[PDB]
Amino acid sequence: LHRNSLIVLADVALFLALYHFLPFEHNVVLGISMLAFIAVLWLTEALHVTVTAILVPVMAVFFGIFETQAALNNFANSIIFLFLGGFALAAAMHHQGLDKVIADKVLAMAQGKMSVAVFMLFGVTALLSMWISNTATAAMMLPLVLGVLSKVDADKQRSTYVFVLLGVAYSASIGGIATLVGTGPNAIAAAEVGLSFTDWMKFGLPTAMMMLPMAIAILYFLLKPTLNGMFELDRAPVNWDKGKVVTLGIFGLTVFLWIFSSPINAALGGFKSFDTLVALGAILMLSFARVVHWKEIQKTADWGILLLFGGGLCLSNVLKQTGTSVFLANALSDMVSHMGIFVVILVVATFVVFLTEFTSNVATTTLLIPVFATVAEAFGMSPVLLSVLIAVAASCAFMLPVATPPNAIVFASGHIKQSEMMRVGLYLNIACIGLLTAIAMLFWQ
Amino acid sequence: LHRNSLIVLADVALFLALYHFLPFEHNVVLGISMLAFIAVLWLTEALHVTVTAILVPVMAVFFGIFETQAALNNFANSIIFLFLGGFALAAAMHHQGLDKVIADKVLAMAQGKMSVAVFMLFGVTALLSMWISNTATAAMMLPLVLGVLSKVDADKQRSTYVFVLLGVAYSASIGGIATLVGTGPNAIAAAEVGLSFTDWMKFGLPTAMMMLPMAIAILYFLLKPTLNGMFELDRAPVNWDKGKVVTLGIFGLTVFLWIFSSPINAALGGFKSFDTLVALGAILMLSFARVVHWKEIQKTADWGILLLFGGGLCLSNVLKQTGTSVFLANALSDMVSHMGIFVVILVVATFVVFLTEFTSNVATTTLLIPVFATVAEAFGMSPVLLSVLIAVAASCAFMLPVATPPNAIVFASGHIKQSEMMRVGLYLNIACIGLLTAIAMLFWQ
Ligand code: NA
Ligand code: NA
Ligand code: NA
Ligand code: NA
């Protein structure tokens, strides 16, 4: 009866059709049929992204691709735990309120000017996003933005107070592209290609550094009348209490180890997934130091995403084992050799940047990274480039809401028009396809 | 400064002491020192049970027992997922309110009599517990019990209304010993020795059937004046709405497959952890049938316990790999051969039944099952017996509150005295040590 129940039934039909009708060696048919099936379910979101994630192994197993345990093992991948460590680290500084104090301390640095208020609102949203989340950083910033944009209250004077709402909802998404914790895609890239925390920062941070000015410049150079206004610093001020200095201390130590993971680990006897251990060491320090309880981390942790990661890793392995990765590489062989590597990464960059407007950031990365990385490997090229690219571009959701929760959060502010966001995003999208294809060309040799 | 911070520091000291001072082959020292360290942390609960669980792998890995990934893989064990399926199945019938309707439908079967009210209150709490939880079934029953015990309101007439409060808090714990979903210990036993869902029901259900009458008989034959009273059926009645019949349908189908897993799987081509698949198939059916959203399952699921499971599995493997399992078997060799198998299981049964009053149900099972099962295997005996026994006896917490949340829930009802519970539990404990040692002897050949 429901829309989504039909999409599912239509998909079951599609699979059954592809399964019986495709003219290839059995394994490839199965792999293709599965790929299409999952592809739909994550794009349409007829079933919750995570339910789909769980579906991958159960299928794999039933269609004899893997044994039950072999398939589930995917879910305990070390990056998944690294991300859990990220969730715990966030949970700590939110419950501690260290996110609030970094907001006030930097926001009250601006004396009483709306000019240097919003520019410091974007700079904080981005810096906080690096470690916390997007969905979380946005919902946490909304009250702080509405507080400031209440002096220039005139909402007949909209474009003063739309530049700042849409400003943070992008700064949350751009701040995610900074480190391996922050947004899902980055994790799925790292898990697929085997990146360290300090590896994904070498890519992402430059890109975030580049993109945030480029994004504000585009919002600015539409309709900004914000060089005017005054402040209302209205609420109780903040102060470092029982180890908000300790949470920062652990955080600092954790981030330190993460950056210097390469020499620290090497000069420690080279432990296997060192970053994940650092992330668990975080969980342990944070608990021994009593600074955050567990019930907090259980609420903060998005187990749905943690599960999703594994569902997609499983998929990747389904593609390899069935030889679907190699079959597609053969199929694309003529096309990709006729295309330049510029052409390819331009097409890839464009495809996602717009496909991410329709669908969930992760859901698409969980779909695309496996297909692309594994096919790239069949061609005997380094799957890293394409993967990192997909992961970044997936977080380039700037057009409509429903693209990312940060978009839908500043939108529910019953003010910003559908039409408005759609065309700033349309510019920013293209702006990015440039910047990415540009940077992706520079990170080659 | 805090109590627990010192316990931890004292433990760090203890480890360091055992590590440097024990006079054995390196591996055994390491294994022993670890075993002791963890043993403390789970018994004292100086760090949250789950934080300790995470500590196992991080140790294992740092002390070169396992590689980082190999260690984490423990957490994706198929039973862990089977339990997640249980959490989803529960989440469904609670959000759907199918737990409420099974309460009313059976409670309103009793026309207006307190005699057949409380006897049907225990029978429901136990039946609901089989699938839901203990902590959850208890907190869900408390309002339904206080509703009934408001006609015989006279709390100078306490022992009418203490027999029923303490009655359900035991019926929740006894109902847990029925199936593989229900309480943690049962899962940790199944994961350790490789039990099917239908395997742990062959043990547990008879034991629950036996124990519930035996427990009420002991509460009854203390201070019961409840053959008197009348009903106040006060609140809106219940009715089967949008697929409360569907939730029951899936539930029924799931439970059906679980029981008949053996012939269904065998006549299907023998898939590996069939029960876990059935449990995931539950999650999928429940979502396709739209009957429960995911955000619900993420709230219901105790990820803390799911993580704990893996922490203990890891431990077990730490014990094997270091040969600590074999070293202890050699150490106990003279003692256990001097003891009868009766003597042994009597000592085991007694030890836990009382140790579970001081500590968390799971925490102790996660500690003891590994030690006992792996040592039992070194003796070349079937680790099943001792394990099942420990898992059951761990859920025999009847004395003080803080033993189980169900105990602490009916206690916060600002009525039942410390002294009262402590001596009913003291009888019921001994009563069980009999029943278990009795049954455990019968389940031999
Ligand atoms: Na982020
Ligand atoms: Na998106
Ligand atoms: Na239970
Ligand atoms: Na207990």
Residue numbers in the entry:
A (entry chain B), B (entry chain A): 18 to 462
Task: List sentences quoted exactly from the publication behind this structure.
Membrane transporters belonging to the ubiquitous divalent anion/Na+ symporter (DASS) family move Krebs cycle intermediates or sulphate across the cell membrane typically by utilizing the preexisting Na+ gradient. However, like other well-characterized bacterial DASS proteins, VcINDY is known to transport succinate and other C4-dicarboxylates, rather than citrate (C6-tricarboxylate)1319.
We crystallized this octuple mutant of VcINDY, denoted MT5, in complex with citrate and determined the crystal structure. Specifically, the side-chain hydroxyl of S200T and the backbone amide of P201G in MT5 each donate an H-bond to the pro-S carboxylate, whereas the side chain of T379V makes van der Waals interactions with the citrate. In contrast to that in VcINDY, the pro-S carboxylate latches onto the amino ends of TM5b and the second helix in HPout in MT5, with its putative negative charge stabilized by the positive helix dipoles (crystallization pH∼7). Specifically, 95 mM citrate reduced the succinate transport rate by <20% in VcINDY, whereas a mere 10 mM citrate decreased the transport rate by >40% in MT5 (at pH 7.4). Since VcINDY and MT5 were inserted into the liposome membrane in presumably two orientations, our data suggested that the membrane-embedded MT5 interacts with trianionic citrate more strongly than VcINDY in both the inward- and outward-facing states. This stark difference is likely attributed to the altered pose of the pro-S carboxylate seen in MT5.
